[PDB]
């Protein structure tokens, strides 16, 4: 098939495959218990570094669940469901990566920690640019 037809599918599947994988880590430690242990530490700092976020009754557990819930929900959509909802999921992920990148940069973590999110941020938007002809 055309390179555009093949390329879009690979990015759409891969990003949903990777982002759902990340969402599982924040929720179920079965895939990698160590990853969840360190991941919860990161989200403990973020809320602790965003008092007003914690002044409205929002805790790290609620924060961790919400982000993981949307990534998996949007990740599977970008893998299986075609059409306009597939692109809508892409936009929502684009609205979470900056929040993730707004948290990592709000704690001064090195590049290696948040490199994966940034790389997929470029691919995530690049997929949207090739949403339709």
């Amino acid at each position: 098939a055309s390179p555009r037809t093949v390329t879009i599918v690979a990015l759409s599947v891969a990003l949903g495959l990777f982002f759902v994988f990340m969402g599982t880590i924040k929720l179920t430690p079965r895939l990698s218990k160590d990853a969840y242990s360190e991941m919860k530490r990161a989200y403990k700092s973020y809320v602790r570094a965003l008092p007003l976020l914690k002044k409205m009754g929002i805790n790290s557990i609620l924060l961790r669940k919400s982000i993981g819930a949307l990534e998996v929900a949007c990740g599977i959509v970008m893998t299986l469901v075609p059409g306009r909802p597939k692109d809508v999921a892409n936009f929502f992920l684009l609205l979470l990566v900056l929040a993730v990148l707004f948290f990592h940069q709000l704690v001064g973590d090195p590049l290696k920690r948040y490199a994966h999110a940034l790389v997929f941020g470029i691919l995530l938007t690049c997929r949207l640019l090739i949403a339709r002809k």
């Binding site: 570094a49 684009l94 990566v97 900056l98 990148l101 707004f102 001064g108 941020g121 470029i122 690049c126």
Partner: protein, 334 residues
């Protein structure tokens, strides 16, 4: 002839003198008047959370056992005499009782007045611990303490008082500043009490109030980030049909912010808590990232000037301008 007269005086003073007993050990409390002249306020070490200071430490007290009468009302003697008599064991300690690093030169001038008053000064280089709270970095201020007192004598045996008005009893040399990235706004002088396992001791404290200078970080980090945010928002004014150009714009600008963010903390120590600078960088990163996200939305609806671009031309500059006003007003009004 002159030497013989003075030799007899020294012999008379030391005849029957017991240096093991403090003056007034059975009659009154020995009052020691102290003042400090800071010849230079050494550099501050952020990594070790310590600072160095060179001072002329002057101490004065009355010892009636050393009264004399002679041709001179004051005896300006060699510092060797100090070791032969009893002197307070004052030391500089960081915290509660841990004596801080001290480097004392051999010279320790001793002057005895006919009334029995003693003046005892020494040249010291003291390295002291100054714990720092870097939450407001680089707009933070610290109160570096300097604590000293008797090691063995409790408040019931030795008490320290300032020679004159407490504010005027600690003098900082005009040109003694050795600070590079800090400004010495002033110091506050106070005294207190500490109860340790060995008893209760009088502690004399001075707090030096330091304010970080933001000029280095304004040039290095804040200004490049602000221009980058402004630069990113120029894309809203470009035509929507330049997809290759604007995509490179978004990606390149995000890369630049990533590079700037990495080099900002390259120098700072790895502190767990987030600083004020991190919040500013993170917000700027979101604005640059969102600028590119805005174009992706615009391209999706490209079949006229996009309405999203027209609104982004106002919302983005407005919010960023408001954020700067709150941020700078919060960390500068203090």
């Amino acid at each position: 002839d002159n030497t013989t007269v003075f030799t007899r005086i020294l012999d008379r003073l030391l005849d029957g003198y017991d240096n093991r007993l403090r003056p007034g050990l059975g009659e009154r409390v020995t009052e020691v008047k102290t003042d400090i002249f800071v010849t230079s306020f050494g550099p501050v070490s952020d990594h070790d959370m310590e600072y160095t200071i060179d001072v002329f430490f002057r101490q004065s007290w009355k010892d009636e056992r050393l009264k004399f009468k002679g041709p001179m009302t004051v005896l300006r003697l060699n510092n060797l005499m100090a070791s032969k008599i009893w002197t307070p064991d004052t030391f500089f300690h960081n915290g509660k009782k841990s004596v801080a690093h001290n480097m004392t030169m051999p010279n320790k001038l001793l002057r005895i007045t006919e009334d029995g008053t003693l003046l005892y000064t020494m040249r010291l280089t003291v390295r002291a611990e100054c714990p720092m709270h870097l939450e407001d970095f680089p707009m933070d201020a610290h109160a570096c303490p300097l604590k000293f007192g008797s090691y063995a004598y409790t408040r019931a045996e030795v008490v320290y008082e300032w020679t004159r008005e407490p504010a005027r009893s600690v003098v900082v040399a005009e040109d003694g500043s050795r600070l590079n990235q800090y400004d010495l706004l002033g110091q506050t002088v106070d005294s207190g009490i500490v109860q340790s396992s060995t008893g209760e001791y009088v502690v004399m404290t001075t707090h030096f109030h330091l304010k970080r200078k933001i000029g280095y970080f304004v040039i290095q980090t804040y200004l490049p980030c602000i221009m980058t945010v402004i630069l990113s928002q120029v894309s809203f004014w470009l035509n929507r049909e330049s997809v290759p150009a604007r995509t490179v714009f978004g990606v390149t600008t995000v890369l630049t912010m990533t590079t700037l963010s990495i080099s900002a903390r390259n120098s700072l120590p790895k502190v767990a808590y987030a600083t004020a600078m991190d919040w500013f960088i993170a917000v700027c990163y979101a604005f640059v990232f969102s600028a590119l996200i805005e174009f992706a939305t615009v391209n999706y609806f490209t079949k006229s000037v996009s309405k999203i671009d027209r609104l982004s031309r106002i919302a983005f500059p407005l919010l960023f301008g408001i954020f700067n006003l709150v941020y700078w007003a919060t960390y500068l009004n203090r």
